[PDB]
Write a protein that binds this ligand. Structure first.
Ligand SMILES: [Mn+2]
Ligand SMILES: [Mn+2]
Lengths: 14, 488
């Protein structure tokens, strides 16, 4: 989610 | 004037599976869904693997699924794109890589990166391609600084990756390990700079030293510390001091990218992708800009649209549905319904579905909506519990809401597409009756509540927006390479 961006595994490590 | 609504209804984490065993979808009493399924045209579409821009074999997910739904095309992920550029050669013609190579030959190359096949932050096969490229363009000194995973892959697996990579060093002839750091040091992201420092130093200043990568790692194991927590260390006589960073996810590469960047002279510094690290780096891969998602096409045909979901899937029907964009389109409005505050949603399987349903009925009664994008989060959020009876009650609550919603749309002479973004609740137990807490690779159902049409017998999430545009009698832009599921 918020910690990352859509093109960098937004389903993981949240 | 008043309008007849067209609604996309996403039952999140709800797919087709043959067996009833651990299958909350089939065990649930869902009379409304079943009534619509028997009455109206139906098909089933792919929501996993390459069909949603992921690597072959990989289960789908809410972020990827909602982006593919909104985009009306396959949205290719970074990992998939890089893998494809290697399989097709583009990688080796990459300007920023050939530049980097030319620069160390004219001053006649370090490589940083998470050394695993986790695919979340990096993939070491991309390292194998960097090496091979350097072996083609004849590079002499290649130093690989390894960050150890144990988190996106098996907790104690670093020796496998190190062994395969030194085999590659040998089967290829160049490259060696200069330093080895657990990602707990080189890939912190919570501003814990005491941890970042140890990794900076190993990469050749004050730091532990061992004769091989294997030796230091085995030393860590003997001290109860697995790959993620491996204390940084130098490989003896193998690190001559000081660049490509092959991680493609910024959030865990940024802090280390800032330490290193923020005293050497004439340093060529590249990152596989642009990080938020506040320094000037060459960028190996540029993003695809997504335009003409369904929200933009609705806007440009002067349609009104609503995005609605409770908290857990609100990003998905807004930011991800709009192609990675937070801003509303003109004509777009949104309803956020608060999710229950519980640690896990098996404690309240109905979540806030009834309040989502009531909020939707309020908006439909205004009579001003062309397009509705609604997600019921429950099957996915409860199914992640791996508990059968909670996930059944989650589907039963959604089914009751679904009936009130679709019946109103149909009484306004509108249309609904009832589908999902990937599976989950169709398997909440393993075959040995243990909790199964992940998404599935199963295909998702599609119901189109228009009589007298025939649907294509297969498809993918990228086809849903074309289908909506079909029902809206709106022209489909070229950017949308998907195809309407309605036959003509
Ligand atoms: Mn989902
Ligand atoms: Mn999920």
């Amino acid at each position: 989610x918020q910690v990352t961006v859509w093109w960098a595994s937004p389903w993981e490590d949240c | 004037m008043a309008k007849k609504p067209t609604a996309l209804i996403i039952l999140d984490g709800f797919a087709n599976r043959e067996s009833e065993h651990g299958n909350a979808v089939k065990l649930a009493n869902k009379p409304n869904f079943d009534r619509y399924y028997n009455k109206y045209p139906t098909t089933q579409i792919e929501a996993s693997g390459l069909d949603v821009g992921l690597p072959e074999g990989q289960m789908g997910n809410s972020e990827v699924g909602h982006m593919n739904i909104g985009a009306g095309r396959i949205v290719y992920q970074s990992l998939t794109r890089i893998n494809k550029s290697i399989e097709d050669g583009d990688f080796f013609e990459n300007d920023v890589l050939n530049n980097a190579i030319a620069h160390v030959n004219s001053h006649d190359l370090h490589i940083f990166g998470l050394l695993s096949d986790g695919g979340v932050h990096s993939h070491y096969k991309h390292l194998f391609a960097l090496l091979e490229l350097a072996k083609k363009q004849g590079v002499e000194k290649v130093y690989v600084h390894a960050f150890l995973d144990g988190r996106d892959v098996d907790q104690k697996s670093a020796l496998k990756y190190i062994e395969e990579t030194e085999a590659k060093f040998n089967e290829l002839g160049i490259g060696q390990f200069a330093s080895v750091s657990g990602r707990y040091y080189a890939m912190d992201r919570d501003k814990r700079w005491e941890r970042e420092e140890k990794a900076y130093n190993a990469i050749n200043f004050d730091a532990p030293t061992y004769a091989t990568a294997k030796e230091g790692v085995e030393a860590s194991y003997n001290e109860g510390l697995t790959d993620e927590f491996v204390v940084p260390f130098i490989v003896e006589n193998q690190n001559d001091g000081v660049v490509i960073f092959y991680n493609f996810r910024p959030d865990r590469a940024a802090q280390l990218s800032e330490i290193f960047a923020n005293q050497v002279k004439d340093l060529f510094y590249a990152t596989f992708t642009k990080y938020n690290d506040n320094i000037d780096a060459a960028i190996v891969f540029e993003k695809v800009d997504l335009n003409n998602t369904i929200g933009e096409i609705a806007q440009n045909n002067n349609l009104t649209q609503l995005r609605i979901a409770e908290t857990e899937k609100y990003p998905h029907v807004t930011y991800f549905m709009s192609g990675g964009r937070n801003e509303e389109f003109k004509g777009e409005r949104r309803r956020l319904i608060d999710s229950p505050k519980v640690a896990t949603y098996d404690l309240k399987p109905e979540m806030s579905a009834y309040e989502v349903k009531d909020a939707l009925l309020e908006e439909l009664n205004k009579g001003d909506l062309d397009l509705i994008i609604l997600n019921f989060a429950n099957p996915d959020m409860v199914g992640h519990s791996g508990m059968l009876e909670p996930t059944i009650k989650a589907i039963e609550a959604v089914d009751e809401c679904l009936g009130e919603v679709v019946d109103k749309i149909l009484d306004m002479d509108g249309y609904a597409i009832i589908t999902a973004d990937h599976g989950n609740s169709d398997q909440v137990l393993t075959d040995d009756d243990q909790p199964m807490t992940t998404h599935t690779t199963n295909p998702v159902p599609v119901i189109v509540t228009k009589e007298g049409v025939t649907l294509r017998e297969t498809g993918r999430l990228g086809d849903l927006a074309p289908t909506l545009l079909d029902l809206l009698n709106v022209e489909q832009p070229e950017d949308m390479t998907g195809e309407s599921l309605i036959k003509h």
